[model samples]
Target: KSCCPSTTARNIYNTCRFGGGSRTLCAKLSGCKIVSGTTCPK
Candidate 1:
């Protein structure tokens, strides 16, 4: 993946990319949500 806005965001990004529980993980770390299976909100 590319550079992220911040370290926490990057963590969330990676979880969204590989983790099966992307939405839950991403949401726990960042307010952003994932959609379309694994697309993190921009």
Candidate 2:
């Protein structure tokens, strides 16, 4: 988890540690394939 170079990983770590949300971070990252304005699906 410490070798992550992408912003998504960093955001995920922050969200996981801070216990809030990662919507904004996911929205900013590319190749994410956002399904709607309020969700992120892999």
Candidate 3:
């Protein structure tokens, strides 16, 4: 297992869609590896 969180996919989507957040920023925020670009809890 890798770093991750329980927030739904929509939560992450909003972060990128309108939250003005970047993938890098997200990873930093949750420490969850955005490796697949589709799934987060990886």
Candidate 4:
């Protein structure tokens, strides 16, 4: 999971990994998207 280009992207992905809440919602906070079951940002 060491692929985020930005610091904010890490937190965005971290939120998804934590399993504390919605996955997509975490992506919503950043420029992330669910691609092939993995979350990544463009």
Top model by lDDT, which number?
4
Better of 1 and 4 by lDDT: 4
Q: In candidate 1, where is summed lDDT lowest over 10 consecutive residues? A: 32-41
Residue lDDT tens for model 3, 1-42:
224565664366446635677666665665556565455464
Worst 10 residues of 4 by lDDT: 32-41
Model 4 Cα displacement at 20 (Å)?
A: 2.8
Deviation from native of the Cα of residue 20 in model 3, angstroms: 1.0
- Each prediction's TM-score versus the true structure: 0.39, 0.34, 0.37, 0.46
Report residue 35 deviation for candidate 2 (angstroms): 35
Candidate 3, residue 27: Cα displacement in angstroms equals 1.8
* Candidate 4: residue 27 Cα off by (Å): 0.5
Flag the better candidate by TM-score, 3 or 4: 4
CA-lDDT, candidates in order: 0.55, 0.45, 0.55, 0.60
lDDT of 4 by residue, 1-42 (tens): 234556788687777757765555665555556556366446
Q: Which wins on TM-score, candidate 2 or candidate 3?
A: 3
Candidate 3 lDDT score relative to the true structure: 0.55
Tens-place lDDT per residue, model 1, 1-42, is 234446787676677756565555655565544445444445
Backbone collision tally, model 2: 0
Q: Please list all clashing residue pairs in model 2, or write none if there are none.
A: none
